[PDB]
Amino acid sequence: HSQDLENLYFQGSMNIFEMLRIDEGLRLKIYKDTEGYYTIGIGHLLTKSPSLNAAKSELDKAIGRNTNGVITKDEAEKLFNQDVDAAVRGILRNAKLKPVYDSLDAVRRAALINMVFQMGETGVAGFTNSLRMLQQKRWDEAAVNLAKSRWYNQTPNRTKRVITTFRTGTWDAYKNLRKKLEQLYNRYKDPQDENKIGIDGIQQFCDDLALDPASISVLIIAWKFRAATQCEFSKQEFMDGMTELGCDSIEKLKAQIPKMEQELKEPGRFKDFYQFTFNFAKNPGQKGLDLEMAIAYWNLVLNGRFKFLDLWNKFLLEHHKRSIPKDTWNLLLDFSTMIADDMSNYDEEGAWPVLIDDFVEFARPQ
Ligand SMILES: C[C@@H](O)O[C@H]1CN(Cc2ccccc2)CC[C@@H]1NC(=O)Nc1cccc(C(F)(F)F)c1
């Protein structure tokens, strides 16, 4: 089969896919990109349809099996290699890029392809002088010139690695990045399970970031790392998150935290964070969230936002209810958003959870 990765075994193990895995990141489950479109792998758009089922159909078609929206790294590489072939075809039809591309060795061609993936042909073609320097093998001068650009300002850590690749014609920047992340991960990993960071390592990570593990900032970090569960931090989560956040050190991650916090002010992002909290907090083996844990996280995330939070605590402390289902968790935010200061506009026919109907009856008097 034409796309089999065995057909590439004569290449080096480092390649354009591994390069973009470091610079852009790899996602193995369907997700919505910036513009809200279903995507997988390394930036592989599946469809503009709002239908997840449509996206899954395209994915199942491309992979040759029932993926249910989840793929392996090798499958992502096959999709990516198709995308690279198309990008190279475009480069080769581009009168300004073709001569540069043709002149470069394989490693530096990967650096040029990386640029095209990030900014498109027009963007890359605008680097007239730097492209000429590359064609003339004036590597140090090209590197100096590229570092002066807006590209460098937009993504300095990625751009520095791509520039190093042009300067040296080696994969050194990527080997170094990988080692730095491995060595940092190793500071936190569970000594009995190299696949995750346990409670002790999470505490150490918080200590290194000078944050209280019970702070909202630490939950915000977990949200940005798309962490599955509060009780562990997987190697994959750690690597994907450091990649997505453009950080290869604790100092860089620390500097990123206020930027993460600011995102909560953008449209829909607090809701996304609030909904994330339920799955993160709950025991993986349970469908619902134990009431006591729900109360603790509600107090962390809603204090100062939900004007009836103290009354909600009073109500629940009387309650028996063992646990909270996802829909009830989600709808409390909607309730908080719509409710009048005196609860006078509650719609009992709005199909709110019974828990919220009961709360309104309890609270109105107070
Ligand atoms: C594991 C221990 O050191 O700290 C915890 C105490 N918890 C305190 C708390 C309980 C209930 C409500 C609010 C706060 C919050 C979760 C917190 N655990 C936690 O942050 N886990 C975590 C899991 C994956 C990823 C990350 C993160 F990326 F580092 F943020 C953290």
Side-chain angles (χ1 to χ4, degrees), residues 2-47 49-60 62-235 237-321 323-366:
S2 66
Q3 290 194 159
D4 290 347
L5 300 176
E6 285 85 356
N7 294 327
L8 306 184
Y9 276 19
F10 71 92
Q11 294 180 344
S13 56
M14 190 60 194
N15 59 36
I16 183 66
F17 175 74
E18 300 297 335
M19 192 193 207
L20 277 289
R21 181 172 169 214
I22 285 163
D23 283 343
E24 179 172 345
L26 172 63
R27 305 277 292 263
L28 299 180
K29 302 178 293 193
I30 295 178
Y31 69 101
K32 298 188 178 188
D33 71 354
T34 292
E35 316 189 272
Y37 298 138
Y38 296 119
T39 303
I40 202 167
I42 307 187
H44 186 79
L45 176 58
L46 291 166
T47 181
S49 172
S51 165
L52 177 59
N53 281 331
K56 287 185 180 169
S57 174
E58 305 301 352
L59 182 60
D60 283 354
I63 305 301
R65 67 177 182 88
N66 179 1
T67 73
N68 310 284
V70 181
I71 65 176
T72 66
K73 178 173 105 67
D74 284 354
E75 287 164 351
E77 182 176 351
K78 291 185 199 174
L79 296 175
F80 181 79
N81 288 341
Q82 291 174 3
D83 292 345
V84 169
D85 286 340
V88 171
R89 271 191 306 273
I91 288 164
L92 293 172
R93 308 193 274 273
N94 184 305
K96 195 160 169 185
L97 303 177
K98 170 178 161 61
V100 188
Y101 182 88
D102 284 347
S103 79
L104 292 171
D105 56 279
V107 174
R108 293 187 176 92
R109 281 177 179 175
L112 193 68
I113 293 164
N114 186 317
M115 294 183 73
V116 171
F117 273 112
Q118 189 175 351
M119 70 193 74
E121 292 180 17
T122 300
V124 179
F127 289 87
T128 307
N129 291 337
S130 292
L131 292 170
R132 187 171 302 119
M133 292 171 179
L134 293 174
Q135 192 160 6
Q136 297 175 17
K137 309 202 191 293
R138 292 168 63 191
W139 310 125
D140 286 344
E141 287 168 286
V144 169
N145 212 46
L146 291 166
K148 299 176 176 186
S149 69
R150 174 171 182 163
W151 176 40
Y152 183 101
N153 186 246
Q154 298 282 167
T155 55
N157 307 294
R158 170 175 188 177
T159 301
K160 280 182 262 183
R161 291 190 288 273
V162 177
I163 292 174
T164 292
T165 307
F166 285 132
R167 188 170 58 77
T168 67
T170 76
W171 296 114
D172 291 353
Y174 295 87
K175 291 186 179 161
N176 292 342
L177 178 282
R178 279 176 165 185
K179 193 69 62 164
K180 200 169 182 189
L181 289 183
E182 289 176 12
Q183 290 180 337
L184 184 59
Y185 177 75
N186 286 348
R187 177 176 176 84
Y188 305 117
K189 69 182 172 60
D190 179 345
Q192 298 301 307
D193 181 3
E194 71 179 53
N195 293 311
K196 59 95 148 76
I197 297 163
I199 297 298
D200 286 344
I202 291 160
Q203 179 77 53
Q204 187 67 62
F205 185 73
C206 291
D207 291 351
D208 291 346
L209 291 167
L211 293 171
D212 187 319
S215 67
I216 200 170
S217 293
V218 167
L219 182 59
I220 292 167
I221 295 166
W223 168 65
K224 289 305 300 184
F225 280 81
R226 298 197 297 279
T229 186
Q230 59 164 306
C231 76
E232 64 169 47
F233 184 11
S234 73
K235 188 173 189 178
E237 285 161 359
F238 178 91
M239 298 300 180
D240 288 350
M242 293 295 278
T243 297
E244 292 176 29
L245 294 170
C247 294
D248 63 11
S249 71
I250 288 295
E251 290 77 12
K252 286 171 179 172
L253 181 60
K254 182 62 170 177
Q256 190 65 28
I257 293 166
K259 304 180 180 63
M260 305 176 197
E261 294 167 348
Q262 275 295 108
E263 175 171 358
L264 294 176
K265 299 171 184 308
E266 296 300 315
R269 302 311 294 154
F270 185 81
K271 178 175 176 177
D272 187 89
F273 168 73
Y274 174 80
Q275 296 197 352
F276 159 87
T277 296
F278 178 89
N279 313 290
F280 175 73
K282 172 179 64 68
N283 180 322
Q286 282 187 39
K287 306 269 204 298
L289 180 60
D290 262 16
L291 183 59
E292 169 172 9
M293 190 67 71
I295 290 169
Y297 271 103
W298 274 322
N299 287 333
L300 182 62
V301 305
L302 297 182
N303 197 29
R305 295 181 179 257
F306 179 31
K307 60 199 173 195
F308 301 120
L309 183 61
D310 289 347
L311 277 166
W312 181 247
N313 277 263
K314 193 176 181 315
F315 172 65
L316 294 176
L317 284 176
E318 306 185 343
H319 237 258
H320 290 164
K321 241 165 185 148
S323 75
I324 301 301
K326 185 171 183 65
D327 187 58
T328 296
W329 177 273
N330 287 348
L331 286 171
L332 188 65
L333 184 60
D334 294 334
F335 172 78
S336 181
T337 298
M338 73 75 56
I339 196 64
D341 294 355
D342 64 355
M343 292 195 182
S344 62
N345 68 335
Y346 187 66
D347 183 357
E348 297 182 2
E349 301 183 308
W352 298 103
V354 178
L355 187 66
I356 299 183
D357 288 344
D358 285 351
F359 177 56
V360 171
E361 288 184 352
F362 166 95
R364 279 192 163 134
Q366 267 112 338

